[PDB]
Amino acid sequence: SEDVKYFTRAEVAKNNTKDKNWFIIHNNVYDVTAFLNEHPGGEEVLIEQAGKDATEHFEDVGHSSDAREMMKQYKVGELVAEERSN
Ligand code: HEM
Numbered sequence: 001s002e003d004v005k006y007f008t009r010a011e012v013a014k015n016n017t018k019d020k021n022w023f024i025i026h027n028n029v030y031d032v033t034a035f036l037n038e039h040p041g042g043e044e045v046l047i048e049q050a051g052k053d054a055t056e057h058f059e060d061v062g063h064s065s066d067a068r069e070m071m072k073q074y075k076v077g078e079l080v081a082e083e084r085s086n
């Protein structure tokens with residue numbers, strides 16, 4: 001009864017512009033198209049990562065507990081395991 005959708009990195013890479021702004025962080029896939037102007041760190045750092053694995057950039061910032069919880073509402077799925085960063 002889990003209802004997780006699994007994506008490949010090629011599928012994520014198709015969603016690579018500000019109007020379909022997806023990225024991967026720690027093997028979770030997020031669609032932040034509706035978050036761009038709500039992000040305290042601005043929209044450009046997020047548009048720069050559209051279609052990519054943004055894990056290292058996200059971690060370099062050291063986001064807070066509240067930012068980590070806020071992210072969950074933008075999760076749309078997870079990477080297929082064979083492409084995961086382990
Ligand atoms: C593309 C990956 C991301 C990058 C590069 C990024 C970058 C940044 C930057 C530069 C700041 C300003 C704070 C600082 O520089 O000290 C920031 C703050 C913040 N970001 Fe992001 N961010 C990313 C993804 C997200 C996501 C998905 C969320 C959640 C919905 C989020 C939520 C926040 C919040 C709430 C803050 C305020 C500080 C904190 O709570 O940690 N960010 N971000």
Ligand SMILES: [Mg+2]
Pocket residue numbers: none
């Ligand atoms: Mg910059």
Ligand SMILES: [Mg+2]
Pocket residue numbers: 016047048049050
């Ligand atoms: Mg780009």
